[PDB]
Amino acid sequence: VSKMRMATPLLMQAG
Amino acid sequence: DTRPRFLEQVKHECHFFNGTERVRFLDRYFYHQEEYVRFDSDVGEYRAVTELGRPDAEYWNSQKDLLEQKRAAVDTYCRHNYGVGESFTVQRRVYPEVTVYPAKTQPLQHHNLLVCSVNGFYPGSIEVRWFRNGQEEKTGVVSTGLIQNGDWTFQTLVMLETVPRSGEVYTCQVEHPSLTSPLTVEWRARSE
Amino acid sequence: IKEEHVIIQAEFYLNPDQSGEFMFDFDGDEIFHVDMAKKETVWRLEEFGRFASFEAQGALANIAVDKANLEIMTKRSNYTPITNVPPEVTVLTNSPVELREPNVLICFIDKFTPPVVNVTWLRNGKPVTTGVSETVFLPREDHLFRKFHYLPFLPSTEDVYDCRVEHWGLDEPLLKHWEFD
């Protein structure tokens, strides 16, 4: 089987 | 529970044109329903959709490797996942089942609704046509449109307003990517 | 020319409920979601998992980033809460009804937010759970949600059915009725 790839959300800048 | 609620959504979107010849990737960020920042592969960097997204677009765009990775998503993510899923999604074909019945039991010469119920098909694109004695009815057709059942099948109900009379044969004709030729189901006009 | 297909990986995180969701959508149907409690991939149709795999554990790190981003935006927005959008509810059968021949009632819950509902099937006013199933919250292009609930049943002249939906945008529970004829 082949693997579905996951997109990653970016962490926003806090402060 | 009356406590206020706060919702964050992220949608990583892959839009495919002409197979996978042209692909558009969208990295989209939402607060409740309001998109505030996005990456569009057609633009090539993050852009603030609202003013609340300005700090994130500026920060993320400053990270060079991060931007190159998102710019390659059309290949490493979109095209890859299309390839992995193609066999059971893009290529999924399931036959429609077609049932025809009059909506009410009437003697002939009285107005009636002939129902063409089309069920269980995949994909959603379908053409349903009504015919009377081989002539297409372009009037009096009432349709629900496409109904998604949530389980990778669709249904649609297409009704025809008519006055059934002796000798008439009404035909519901269905064209669908699962079919090599139109599927037809007849109702010969009859009392009750 | 118009697009042929769209695949969306949709995620959400909701405070203060602390509810997260991670799913893939193809042309409006759910390919799979990750069970957040059991940390496992749930293919919408079992056959899908004979062609594809997905590492469920990575979805939980995504949701944690989603949670962290939500808390930032909550503060950034000066704690502006969501506006409840009550759902439209429709009940249909998946197949033409034949008396005493098995069928399925579908409760279609559409165009609502936040993604939190209570759904009950009622047969002659009594809750029914035998064989019921349901989807997770599906994304809409307007960024509201859809959801489906299902009830296998044996059509008859003697029973009536309601889908009862509770949602914070409703003043009262919404019942959507179905009976033969």
mmCIF file of all heavy atoms in Angstrom, chain B residues 134-174:
data_model
loop_
_atom_site.group_PDB
_atom_site.id
_atom_site.type_symbol
_atom_site.label_atom_id
_atom_site.label_comp_id
_atom_site.label_asym_id
_atom_site.label_seq_id
_atom_site.Cartn_x
_atom_site.Cartn_y
_atom_site.Cartn_z
ATOM 1 N N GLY B 134 -40.856 8.765 -26.955
ATOM 2 C CA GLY B 134 -39.567 9.019 -27.557
ATOM 3 C C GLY B 134 -39.205 10.476 -27.712
ATOM 4 O O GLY B 134 -38.104 10.772 -28.188
ATOM 5 N N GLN B 135 -40.086 11.396 -27.329
ATOM 6 C CA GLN B 135 -39.822 12.826 -27.436
ATOM 7 C C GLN B 135 -39.442 13.372 -26.070
ATOM 8 O O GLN B 135 -40.149 13.136 -25.085
ATOM 9 C CB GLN B 135 -41.042 13.570 -27.986
ATOM 10 C CG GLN B 135 -41.781 12.835 -29.095
ATOM 11 C CD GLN B 135 -41.124 13.005 -30.454
ATOM 12 O OE1 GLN B 135 -39.922 13.272 -30.553
ATOM 13 N NE2 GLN B 135 -41.913 12.849 -31.512
ATOM 14 N N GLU B 136 -38.336 14.108 -26.015
ATOM 15 C CA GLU B 136 -37.833 14.602 -24.744
ATOM 16 C C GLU B 136 -38.746 15.688 -24.191
ATOM 17 O O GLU B 136 -39.136 16.620 -24.901
ATOM 18 C CB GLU B 136 -36.408 15.134 -24.898
ATOM 19 C CG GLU B 136 -35.773 15.548 -23.570
ATOM 20 C CD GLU B 136 -34.332 16.028 -23.716
ATOM 21 O OE1 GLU B 136 -33.765 15.911 -24.826
ATOM 22 O OE2 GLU B 136 -33.768 16.513 -22.707
ATOM 23 N N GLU B 137 -39.089 15.560 -22.916
ATOM 24 C CA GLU B 137 -39.846 16.581 -22.203
ATOM 25 C C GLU B 137 -38.875 17.636 -21.695
ATOM 26 O O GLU B 137 -38.055 17.360 -20.819
ATOM 27 C CB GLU B 137 -40.616 15.963 -21.045
ATOM 28 C CG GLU B 137 -41.603 14.930 -21.476
ATOM 29 C CD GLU B 137 -42.952 15.535 -21.746
ATOM 30 O OE1 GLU B 137 -43.040 16.781 -21.815
ATOM 31 O OE2 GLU B 137 -43.925 14.768 -21.881
ATOM 32 N N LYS B 138 -38.963 18.843 -22.242
ATOM 33 C CA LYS B 138 -38.168 19.965 -21.770
ATOM 34 C C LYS B 138 -38.973 20.911 -20.892
ATOM 35 O O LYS B 138 -38.498 22.004 -20.567
ATOM 36 C CB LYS B 138 -37.572 20.722 -22.955
ATOM 37 C CG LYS B 138 -36.524 19.932 -23.714
ATOM 38 C CD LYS B 138 -36.585 20.221 -25.202
ATOM 39 C CE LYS B 138 -35.501 19.459 -25.948
ATOM 40 N NZ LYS B 138 -34.156 19.637 -25.320
ATOM 41 N N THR B 139 -40.177 20.511 -20.502
ATOM 42 C CA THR B 139 -41.065 21.334 -19.701
ATOM 43 C C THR B 139 -41.695 20.457 -18.628
ATOM 44 O O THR B 139 -41.826 19.242 -18.804
ATOM 45 C CB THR B 139 -42.136 21.989 -20.583
ATOM 46 O OG1 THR B 139 -42.759 23.065 -19.876
ATOM 47 C CG2 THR B 139 -43.185 20.973 -20.987
ATOM 48 N N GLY B 140 -42.054 21.077 -17.506
ATOM 49 C CA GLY B 140 -42.712 20.364 -16.427
ATOM 50 C C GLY B 140 -41.834 19.384 -15.682
ATOM 51 O O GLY B 140 -42.344 18.426 -15.094
ATOM 52 N N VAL B 141 -40.523 19.596 -15.685
ATOM 53 C CA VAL B 141 -39.589 18.708 -15.003
ATOM 54 C C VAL B 141 -39.196 19.358 -13.682
ATOM 55 O O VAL B 141 -38.691 20.488 -13.660
ATOM 56 C CB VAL B 141 -38.366 18.406 -15.881
ATOM 57 C CG1 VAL B 141 -37.384 17.532 -15.141
ATOM 58 C CG2 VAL B 141 -38.813 17.723 -17.167
ATOM 59 N N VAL B 142 -39.468 18.661 -12.581
ATOM 60 C CA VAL B 142 -39.178 19.134 -11.231
ATOM 61 C C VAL B 142 -38.126 18.210 -10.645
ATOM 62 O O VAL B 142 -38.347 16.997 -10.528
ATOM 63 C CB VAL B 142 -40.436 19.160 -10.350
ATOM 64 C CG1 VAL B 142 -40.092 19.616 -8.941
ATOM 65 C CG2 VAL B 142 -41.493 20.063 -10.964
ATOM 66 N N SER B 143 -36.983 18.774 -10.279
ATOM 67 C CA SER B 143 -35.853 17.977 -9.836
ATOM 68 C C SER B 143 -35.357 18.455 -8.485
ATOM 69 O O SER B 143 -35.288 19.656 -8.225
ATOM 70 C CB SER B 143 -34.702 18.032 -10.831
ATOM 71 O OG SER B 143 -33.534 17.494 -10.236
ATOM 72 N N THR B 144 -35.010 17.495 -7.632
ATOM 73 C CA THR B 144 -34.342 17.774 -6.372
ATOM 74 C C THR B 144 -32.901 18.220 -6.555
ATOM 75 O O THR B 144 -32.298 18.709 -5.596
ATOM 76 C CB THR B 144 -34.355 16.524 -5.499
ATOM 77 O OG1 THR B 144 -33.560 15.508 -6.132
ATOM 78 C CG2 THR B 144 -35.788 16.002 -5.313
ATOM 79 N N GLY B 145 -32.330 18.049 -7.746
ATOM 80 C CA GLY B 145 -30.904 18.162 -7.883
ATOM 81 C C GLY B 145 -30.186 16.985 -7.229
ATOM 82 O O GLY B 145 -30.769 15.962 -6.857
ATOM 83 N N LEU B 146 -28.874 17.155 -7.097
ATOM 84 C CA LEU B 146 -28.012 16.085 -6.624
ATOM 85 C C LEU B 146 -28.070 16.012 -5.100
ATOM 86 O O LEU B 146 -27.926 17.031 -4.418
ATOM 87 C CB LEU B 146 -26.584 16.332 -7.115
ATOM 88 C CG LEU B 146 -25.574 15.185 -7.044
ATOM 89 C CD1 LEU B 146 -26.062 13.980 -7.833
ATOM 90 C CD2 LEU B 146 -24.193 15.661 -7.538
ATOM 91 N N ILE B 147 -28.294 14.813 -4.560
ATOM 92 C CA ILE B 147 -28.317 14.611 -3.114
ATOM 93 C C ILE B 147 -27.149 13.710 -2.733
ATOM 94 O O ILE B 147 -27.070 12.553 -3.179
ATOM 95 C CB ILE B 147 -29.646 14.019 -2.626
ATOM 96 C CG1 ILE B 147 -30.797 14.986 -2.938
ATOM 97 C CG2 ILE B 147 -29.567 13.742 -1.118
ATOM 98 C CD1 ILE B 147 -32.180 14.392 -2.703
ATOM 99 N N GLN B 148 -26.246 14.242 -1.910
ATOM 100 C CA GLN B 148 -25.140 13.466 -1.358
ATOM 101 C C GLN B 148 -25.633 12.686 -0.146
ATOM 102 O O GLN B 148 -26.221 13.261 0.772
ATOM 103 C CB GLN B 148 -23.978 14.397 -0.975
ATOM 104 C CG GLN B 148 -22.568 13.807 -1.213
ATOM 105 C CD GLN B 148 -21.449 14.854 -1.362
ATOM 106 O OE1 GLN B 148 -21.569 15.988 -0.895
ATOM 107 N NE2 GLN B 148 -20.346 14.459 -2.015
ATOM 108 N N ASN B 149 -25.433 11.369 -0.154
ATOM 109 C CA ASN B 149 -25.874 10.550 0.967
ATOM 110 C C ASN B 149 -24.856 10.477 2.099
ATOM 111 O O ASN B 149 -25.194 9.969 3.179
ATOM 112 C CB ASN B 149 -26.205 9.132 0.500
ATOM 113 C CG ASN B 149 -27.412 9.088 -0.422
ATOM 114 O OD1 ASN B 149 -28.365 9.862 -0.263
ATOM 115 N ND2 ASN B 149 -27.370 8.186 -1.410
ATOM 116 N N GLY B 150 -23.628 10.967 1.885
ATOM 117 C CA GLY B 150 -22.604 10.955 2.915
ATOM 118 C C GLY B 150 -21.784 9.684 2.982
ATOM 119 O O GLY B 150 -20.846 9.606 3.786
ATOM 120 N N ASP B 151 -22.110 8.684 2.166
ATOM 121 C CA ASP B 151 -21.462 7.381 2.200
ATOM 122 C C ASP B 151 -20.844 7.027 0.844
ATOM 123 O O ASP B 151 -20.757 5.854 0.489
ATOM 124 C CB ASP B 151 -22.466 6.311 2.624
ATOM 125 C CG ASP B 151 -23.616 6.171 1.626
ATOM 126 O OD1 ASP B 151 -23.687 6.985 0.670
ATOM 127 O OD2 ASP B 151 -24.436 5.237 1.778
ATOM 128 N N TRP B 152 -20.441 8.042 0.070
ATOM 129 C CA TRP B 152 -19.870 7.881 -1.276
ATOM 130 C C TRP B 152 -20.889 7.330 -2.277
ATOM 131 O O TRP B 152 -20.538 6.588 -3.205
ATOM 132 C CB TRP B 152 -18.617 7.009 -1.255
ATOM 133 C CG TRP B 152 -17.455 7.655 -0.561
ATOM 134 C CD1 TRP B 152 -17.257 7.753 0.787
ATOM 135 C CD2 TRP B 152 -16.335 8.297 -1.181
ATOM 136 N NE1 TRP B 152 -16.086 8.419 1.044
ATOM 137 C CE2 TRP B 152 -15.492 8.753 -0.146
ATOM 138 C CE3 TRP B 152 -15.964 8.529 -2.509
ATOM 139 C CZ2 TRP B 152 -14.299 9.425 -0.397
ATOM 140 C CZ3 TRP B 152 -14.763 9.189 -2.762
ATOM 141 C CH2 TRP B 152 -13.946 9.626 -1.709
ATOM 142 N N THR B 153 -22.162 7.668 -2.083
ATOM 143 C CA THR B 153 -23.196 7.473 -3.088
ATOM 144 C C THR B 153 -24.062 8.726 -3.125
ATOM 145 O O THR B 153 -24.087 9.529 -2.183
ATOM 146 C CB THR B 153 -24.072 6.253 -2.792
ATOM 147 O OG1 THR B 153 -24.872 6.532 -1.636
ATOM 148 C CG2 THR B 153 -23.220 5.019 -2.515
ATOM 149 N N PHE B 154 -24.780 8.878 -4.225
ATOM 150 C CA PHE B 154 -25.671 9.998 -4.452
ATOM 151 C C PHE B 154 -27.060 9.473 -4.784
ATOM 152 O O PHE B 154 -27.243 8.314 -5.160
ATOM 153 C CB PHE B 154 -25.182 10.875 -5.613
ATOM 154 C CG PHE B 154 -23.884 11.606 -5.350
ATOM 155 C CD1 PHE B 154 -22.655 11.004 -5.620
ATOM 156 C CD2 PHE B 154 -23.900 12.915 -4.880
ATOM 157 C CE1 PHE B 154 -21.458 11.703 -5.402
ATOM 158 C CE2 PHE B 154 -22.716 13.619 -4.665
ATOM 159 C CZ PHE B 154 -21.491 13.007 -4.916
ATOM 160 N N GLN B 155 -28.046 10.356 -4.681
ATOM 161 C CA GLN B 155 -29.339 10.056 -5.264
ATOM 162 C C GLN B 155 -29.912 11.348 -5.816
ATOM 163 O O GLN B 155 -29.488 12.448 -5.453
ATOM 164 C CB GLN B 155 -30.297 9.416 -4.254
ATOM 165 C CG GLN B 155 -30.610 10.317 -3.078
ATOM 166 C CD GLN B 155 -31.642 9.719 -2.140
ATOM 167 O OE1 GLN B 155 -32.794 9.536 -2.515
ATOM 168 N NE2 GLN B 155 -31.235 9.438 -0.901
ATOM 169 N N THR B 156 -30.861 11.197 -6.725
ATOM 170 C CA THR B 156 -31.597 12.330 -7.243
ATOM 171 C C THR B 156 -32.989 11.845 -7.629
ATOM 172 O O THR B 156 -33.180 10.688 -8.017
ATOM 173 C CB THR B 156 -30.858 12.978 -8.428
ATOM 174 O OG1 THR B 156 -31.587 14.130 -8.883
ATOM 175 C CG2 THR B 156 -30.685 11.986 -9.564
ATOM 176 N N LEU B 157 -33.967 12.723 -7.470
ATOM 177 C CA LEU B 157 -35.342 12.422 -7.840
ATOM 178 C C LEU B 157 -35.781 13.449 -8.864
ATOM 179 O O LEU B 157 -35.713 14.655 -8.605
ATOM 180 C CB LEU B 157 -36.268 12.425 -6.622
ATOM 181 C CG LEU B 157 -36.346 11.029 -6.004
ATOM 182 C CD1 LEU B 157 -35.139 10.775 -5.091
ATOM 183 C CD2 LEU B 157 -37.667 10.785 -5.274
ATOM 184 N N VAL B 158 -36.204 12.981 -10.030
ATOM 185 C CA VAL B 158 -36.597 13.861 -11.121
ATOM 186 C C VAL B 158 -38.038 13.536 -11.467
ATOM 187 O O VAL B 158 -38.336 12.427 -11.932
ATOM 188 C CB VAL B 158 -35.685 13.711 -12.342
ATOM 189 C CG1 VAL B 158 -36.175 14.593 -13.483
ATOM 190 C CG2 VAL B 158 -34.229 14.051 -11.960
ATOM 191 N N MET B 159 -38.930 14.497 -11.248
ATOM 192 C CA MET B 159 -40.355 14.307 -11.460
ATOM 193 C C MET B 159 -40.807 15.029 -12.724
ATOM 194 O O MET B 159 -40.254 16.063 -13.101
ATOM 195 C CB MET B 159 -41.158 14.822 -10.268
ATOM 196 C CG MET B 159 -40.733 14.273 -8.926
ATOM 197 S SD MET B 159 -41.963 14.709 -7.669
ATOM 198 C CE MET B 159 -42.292 16.421 -8.094
ATOM 199 N N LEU B 160 -41.828 14.474 -13.372
ATOM 200 C CA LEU B 160 -42.390 15.039 -14.594
ATOM 201 C C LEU B 160 -43.875 15.305 -14.395
ATOM 202 O O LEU B 160 -44.635 14.380 -14.093
ATOM 203 C CB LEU B 160 -42.174 14.086 -15.771
ATOM 204 C CG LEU B 160 -42.903 14.459 -17.056
ATOM 205 C CD1 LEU B 160 -42.164 15.626 -17.710
ATOM 206 C CD2 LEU B 160 -42.999 13.247 -17.982
ATOM 207 N N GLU B 161 -44.286 16.560 -14.566
ATOM 208 C CA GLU B 161 -45.704 16.891 -14.591
ATOM 209 C C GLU B 161 -46.280 16.540 -15.952
ATOM 210 O O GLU B 161 -45.776 16.988 -16.984
ATOM 211 C CB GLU B 161 -45.934 18.372 -14.320
ATOM 212 C CG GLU B 161 -45.339 18.860 -13.045
ATOM 213 C CD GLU B 161 -45.486 20.349 -12.885
ATOM 214 O OE1 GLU B 161 -45.874 21.030 -13.860
ATOM 215 O OE2 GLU B 161 -45.214 20.838 -11.777
ATOM 216 N N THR B 162 -47.348 15.762 -15.950
ATOM 217 C CA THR B 162 -47.954 15.375 -17.211
ATOM 218 C C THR B 162 -49.400 14.989 -16.965
ATOM 219 O O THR B 162 -49.876 14.951 -15.827
ATOM 220 C CB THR B 162 -47.180 14.226 -17.875
ATOM 221 O OG1 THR B 162 -47.712 13.990 -19.190
ATOM 222 C CG2 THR B 162 -47.256 12.951 -17.014
ATOM 223 N N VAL B 163 -50.099 14.744 -18.063
ATOM 224 C CA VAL B 163 -51.429 14.159 -18.057
ATOM 225 C C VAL B 163 -51.347 12.831 -18.797
ATOM 226 O O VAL B 163 -51.382 12.790 -20.029
ATOM 227 C CB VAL B 163 -52.467 15.089 -18.709
ATOM 228 C CG1 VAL B 163 -53.847 14.640 -18.342
ATOM 229 C CG2 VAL B 163 -52.239 16.536 -18.292
ATOM 230 N N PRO B 164 -51.201 11.724 -18.075
ATOM 231 C CA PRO B 164 -51.061 10.423 -18.738
ATOM 232 C C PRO B 164 -52.320 10.049 -19.508
ATOM 233 O O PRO B 164 -53.442 10.179 -19.008
ATOM 234 C CB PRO B 164 -50.787 9.462 -17.575
ATOM 235 C CG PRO B 164 -50.210 10.360 -16.483
ATOM 236 C CD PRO B 164 -50.967 11.643 -16.624
ATOM 237 N N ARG B 165 -52.129 9.622 -20.756
ATOM 238 C CA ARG B 165 -53.237 9.205 -21.602
ATOM 239 C C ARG B 165 -52.932 7.860 -22.238
ATOM 240 O O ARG B 165 -51.785 7.407 -22.278
ATOM 241 C CB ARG B 165 -53.568 10.234 -22.695
ATOM 242 C CG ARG B 165 -53.773 11.627 -22.157
ATOM 243 C CD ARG B 165 -53.931 12.640 -23.257
ATOM 244 N NE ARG B 165 -54.314 13.936 -22.710
ATOM 245 C CZ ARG B 165 -55.555 14.270 -22.366
ATOM 246 N NH1 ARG B 165 -56.561 13.406 -22.519
ATOM 247 N NH2 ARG B 165 -55.793 15.475 -21.866
ATOM 248 N N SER B 166 -53.998 7.233 -22.732
ATOM 249 C CA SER B 166 -53.925 5.884 -23.274
ATOM 250 C C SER B 166 -52.859 5.795 -24.356
ATOM 251 O O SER B 166 -52.753 6.675 -25.216
ATOM 252 C CB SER B 166 -55.289 5.487 -23.838
ATOM 253 O OG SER B 166 -55.401 4.086 -23.974
ATOM 254 N N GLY B 167 -52.050 4.738 -24.297
ATOM 255 C CA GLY B 167 -51.063 4.470 -25.309
ATOM 256 C C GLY B 167 -49.705 5.090 -25.065
ATOM 257 O O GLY B 167 -48.724 4.636 -25.662
ATOM 258 N N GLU B 168 -49.614 6.103 -24.203
ATOM 259 C CA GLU B 168 -48.352 6.800 -23.991
ATOM 260 C C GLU B 168 -47.360 5.924 -23.239
ATOM 261 O O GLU B 168 -47.723 5.209 -22.302
ATOM 262 C CB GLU B 168 -48.578 8.089 -23.209
ATOM 263 C CG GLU B 168 -49.482 9.114 -23.892
ATOM 264 C CD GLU B 168 -49.514 10.426 -23.127
ATOM 265 O OE1 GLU B 168 -49.452 10.384 -21.877
ATOM 266 O OE2 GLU B 168 -49.588 11.495 -23.766
ATOM 267 N N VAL B 169 -46.094 5.996 -23.644
ATOM 268 C CA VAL B 169 -44.995 5.371 -22.915
ATOM 269 C C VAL B 169 -44.056 6.479 -22.460
ATOM 270 O O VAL B 169 -43.505 7.218 -23.290
ATOM 271 C CB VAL B 169 -44.254 4.327 -23.770
ATOM 272 C CG1 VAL B 169 -43.046 3.776 -23.021
ATOM 273 C CG2 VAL B 169 -45.196 3.189 -24.173
ATOM 274 N N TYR B 170 -43.886 6.610 -21.147
ATOM 275 C CA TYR B 170 -42.955 7.565 -20.565
ATOM 276 C C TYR B 170 -41.657 6.854 -20.227
ATOM 277 O O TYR B 170 -41.671 5.735 -19.705
ATOM 278 C CB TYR B 170 -43.544 8.219 -19.310
ATOM 279 C CG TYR B 170 -44.701 9.136 -19.623
ATOM 280 C CD1 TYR B 170 -45.991 8.635 -19.786
ATOM 281 C CD2 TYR B 170 -44.500 10.496 -19.789
ATOM 282 C CE1 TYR B 170 -47.047 9.471 -20.090
ATOM 283 C CE2 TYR B 170 -45.552 11.345 -20.097
ATOM 284 C CZ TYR B 170 -46.820 10.832 -20.247
ATOM 285 O OH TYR B 170 -47.852 11.691 -20.556
ATOM 286 N N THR B 171 -40.531 7.503 -20.534
ATOM 287 C CA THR B 171 -39.220 6.907 -20.317
ATOM 288 C C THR B 171 -38.313 7.872 -19.563
ATOM 289 O O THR B 171 -38.149 9.033 -19.967
ATOM 290 C CB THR B 171 -38.570 6.495 -21.649
ATOM 291 O OG1 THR B 171 -39.407 5.533 -22.302
ATOM 292 C CG2 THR B 171 -37.212 5.874 -21.404
ATOM 293 N N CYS B 172 -37.728 7.380 -18.468
ATOM 294 C CA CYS B 172 -36.653 8.058 -17.755
ATOM 295 C C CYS B 172 -35.315 7.524 -18.262
ATOM 296 O O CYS B 172 -35.056 6.316 -18.189
ATOM 297 C CB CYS B 172 -36.772 7.845 -16.246
ATOM 298 S SG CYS B 172 -35.522 8.730 -15.334
ATOM 299 N N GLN B 173 -34.469 8.417 -18.765
ATOM 300 C CA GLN B 173 -33.180 8.035 -19.330
ATOM 301 C C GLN B 173 -32.054 8.627 -18.496
ATOM 302 O O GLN B 173 -32.042 9.831 -18.219
ATOM 303 C CB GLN B 173 -33.055 8.497 -20.773
ATOM 304 C CG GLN B 173 -31.674 8.310 -21.357
ATOM 305 C CD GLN B 173 -31.567 8.971 -22.704
ATOM 306 O OE1 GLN B 173 -31.906 8.379 -23.722
ATOM 307 N NE2 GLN B 173 -31.122 10.224 -22.716
ATOM 308 N N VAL B 174 -31.101 7.781 -18.115
ATOM 309 C CA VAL B 174 -30.017 8.161 -17.221
ATOM 310 C C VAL B 174 -28.692 7.946 -17.940
ATOM 311 O O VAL B 174 -28.465 6.884 -18.531
ATOM 312 C CB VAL B 174 -30.076 7.361 -15.906
ATOM 313 C CG1 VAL B 174 -28.862 7.647 -15.068
ATOM 314 C CG2 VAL B 174 -31.335 7.716 -15.143
#
